[PDB]
Design a protein around this ligand. Structure first.
Ligand SMILES: *[C@@H]1O[C@H](CO)[C@@H](O)[C@H](O)[C@H]1NC(C)=O
Lengths: 50, 49
């Protein structure tokens, strides 16, 4: 403002923020157990055993 | 007459990255065989030495 005495003044501020976050987690587990046992009382020592 | 001027500018950029991984494997396969021929039964009492 000025009146004919002058007084001067001026201000201008600017602020800005930019935040970011990201997370990723992946798990994969597999377990398999297979057992096959055959008891044969056929009567063959070697050939029956095979 | 007088003129006052002033300016300002500032940027602070941050970046973070993190990773993790793990792998495991186990196996315990086995096999067995029994080829029998014959069986005997030793007498318990009244036996010679
Ligand atoms: C500040 O400087 C960094 C580095 O170049 C830039 O990535 C960022 O964008 C700047 N800030 C602005 C508001 O542009």
């Amino acid at each position: 403002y000025e009146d004919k005495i002058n007084v001067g003044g001026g201000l201008s501020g600017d602020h800005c923020k930019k935040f970011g976050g990201g997370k990723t987690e992946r798990a994969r587990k597999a377990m398999a157990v297979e057992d096959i046992i055959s008891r044969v009382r056929g009567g063959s020592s070697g050939w029956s055993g095979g | 007459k007088g003129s006052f001027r002033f300016s300002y500018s500032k940027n602070e950029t941050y970046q973070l990255f993190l990773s993790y991984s793990s792998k495991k494997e186990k196996m315990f396969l086995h096999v067995k065989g029994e080829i029998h021929l014959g069986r005997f039964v030793m007498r318990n009492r009244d036996v010679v030495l």
